[PDB]
Symmetry: C2
Subunit: 398 residues, 2 copies
């Protein structure tokens, strides 16, 4: 059944949409809309899928997908690590109780302060994006009387280094006193449904691993990144962690494997509930105007991304489903076939748990949505709805 | 001179970039980066250009361009109205001292509470986007024992109604007892450098006005929208408010109605600049990357529109220029401020100025990657006011703390 392919904790009961045994109509009425609703057991089940498929690997949640501290803590309690790209993500992981030995720091978002905090915190590994970054980390570690543990990010566009020029970076890094070389990192892409390219990519990593091992390097960690795609479109068939493990089994090695899933844990975990405000026709074209926009979920607008949209209440049209934002590009779906809806009725936007709230802004002075976590009939407000005061607070009495 | 074409308060002094007599390097060292910096006198002078060009018009600032309450207050003190599209902008306009008699409400961003608040506030005019909205506004006004003053948004997208079918909506609205029909609205587009289309557009509205007046409607207001473009590219030549007034003078002589304009970008756009510090240089094959501390989280226009913003060094040093991608801290391939752009070779620690960032800049700034948003400062004749403190991590997640 299509609905349960997206998320098995979703069901219609007597024409009413439920998540983990709680009515979405009741949630919308109680907490208001727009509303982000997350399944606790979906998140746990997806994390556990990685642990079952890769029992000896460290599974670092990619915090970029969703920064809600209650969600990061949920994962932390199951033994998740944290793949971080900023000092704010470090702060969050620490707040969530994820220990530094399970934290890896990727990307180019690395100011002097952020790096100082991370070195001082003794995180597992920096996934290094430039030679200059090697020099900067070396200086910082020296000033703290510490070692910074590193991996070079290799590409088997601003990111990584061609794997064929990677040994050169490893050799350069070996000369810097305050660096300890401990890993190799790749991250080959995102929303990957055909997992075939992972085999060649990991082959090349292991080939590099063997070469550096022969060269005398002690590579303790192979971080093969994230990027496993999820079901967005009805016809999408998503890979499972077990599929990846099957693919890479005869390639994988003494080094500890690290994986960095984000979307494949959070994406289908969350749904966005929005209320229909107005219907209008222009010529033969139909518009359904709702209370959520690109300010709440930006993916359709900026990527032309597909999110499946369903009615919260089923009853007995092709339309643009559009938001409140004063932009022609503010839509959630274009030329989309849906059952006819009326003012006041609720729609569920699926697959909104990753890169959803995370990219939410205050454009048009719109406070962001409340966030609710549901677990087998129980409810927890994990982010209060903002008010106007919150948006402009840093400008008040300053 | 190129820089003054963007903003005449910008200048180099002995190799150092200044705005209104304040060094950008000092501001960057004092307040940190990323930093949004605004020129007070630029904002005032753009607004006054509209006032001088259209002395009998209501000039409604389009709050969507920039919601900083100190900047909105600045315009409100000059007699600006507010063109709003949400309850949040209503709140903001009111806090900034803009009276509801100078507030107009557009867009499809109109929930029951927002509409109730605006009707209750007795705003000048609702620019109505649908017939169902007419019914809803009428129902709400009745419930408050008030009248809602309306215009129909006409298209001479999800917005407006074919002007050829607007008269049917005016007829429909005349039968709704809690609405008072007072206006006609058009908003023809945005970032318009060749103003030619305004003539035909306004001609259609003037013809509709004549037709409605003959039919017995009392059209007090003609709100002809915003959309005047600004200089983004070195080769762009922006129109002046006086150019629009010249184009429309004879056309508007036909009407007795008070004219309303809704400029956003043309007041704020070149008023603001984004200062960012270089973190890393990186070469990858034949490409030079200049990695800075500001990204799509701070200014989204390059990433999502492939928009051109002019980028200059805060310190000129008579160095060779290079072609570079100027990219931010965000973990996306699409997080860039400029691609394949010529720029003076700059080093780690140096600052860059991203021009034309005052409109749809901070307004679209997010917390993606748990990045606190930039401080905002307002410069006026050698002195400065902090108009938004830099956020911290606690601010981002505050609504999740303790319930």
């Amino acid at each position: 059944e299509l609905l349960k392919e997206y998320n098995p904790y979703l069901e219609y009961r007597d024409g009413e949409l439920f998540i983990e045994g709680v009515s979405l109509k009741e949630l919308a009425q109680t907490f208001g809309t727009p509303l982000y609703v997350y399944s606790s057991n979906f998140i746990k089940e997806r994390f556990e899928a990685y642990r079952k498929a890769f029992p000896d690997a460290l599974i670092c949640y990619a915090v970029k997908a969703n920064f809600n501290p209650h969600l990061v803590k949920l994962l932390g309690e199951l033994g998740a690590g944290a793949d971080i790209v900023s000092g704010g993500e470090l702060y969050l992981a620490k707040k969530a109780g994820i220990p530094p030995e399970r934290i890896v720091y990727a990307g180019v978002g690395k100011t002097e302060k952020e790096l100082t905090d991370a070195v001082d915190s003794e995180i597992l590994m920096f996934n290094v994006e430039s030679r200059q970054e090697l020099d900067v980390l070396n200086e910082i570690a020296g000033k703290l009387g510490k070692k910074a543990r590193i991996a070079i990010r290799v590409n088997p566009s601003k990111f990584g280094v061609d794997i064929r020029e990677a040994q050169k970076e490893y050799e350069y890094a070996s000369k810097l006193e305050n660096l300890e070389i401990v890993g190799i990192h790749c991250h080959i892409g995102s929303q990957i449904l055909d997992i075939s390219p992972y085999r060649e990519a990991v082959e090349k990593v292991v080939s590099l691993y063997e070469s550096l091992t022969q060269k005398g390097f002690d590579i303790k960690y192979l971080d093969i990144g994230g990027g496993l795609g999820i079901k967005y479109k009805p016809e999408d068939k998503e890979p499972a962690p077990q599929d990846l493990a099957d693919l890479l089994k005869d390639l994988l090695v003494k080094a500890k494997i690290i994986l960095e899933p984000g979307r494949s844990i959070m994406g289908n975990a969350g749904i966005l509930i929005t209320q229909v405000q107005f219907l209008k026709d222009k010529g033969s074209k139909h518009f359904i105007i709702v209370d959520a926009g690109m300010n709440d979920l930006i993916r359709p607008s900026i990527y032309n991304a597909y999110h499946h949209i369903i009615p919260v209440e089923t009853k007995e049209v092709v339309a643009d489903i559009v938001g409140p934002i004063c932009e022609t590009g503010d839509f959630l779906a274009l030329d989309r076939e849906i059952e006819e809806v009326q003012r006041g009725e609720y729609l569920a936007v699926l697959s909104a748990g990753a890169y959803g709230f995370a990219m939410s802004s205050h454009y048009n002075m719109r406070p962001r949505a409340a966030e609710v976590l549901v677990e087998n009939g129980s409810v927890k407000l994990i982010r209060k709805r903002e008010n106007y005061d919150y948006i402009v607070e840093p400008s008040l009495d300053i």
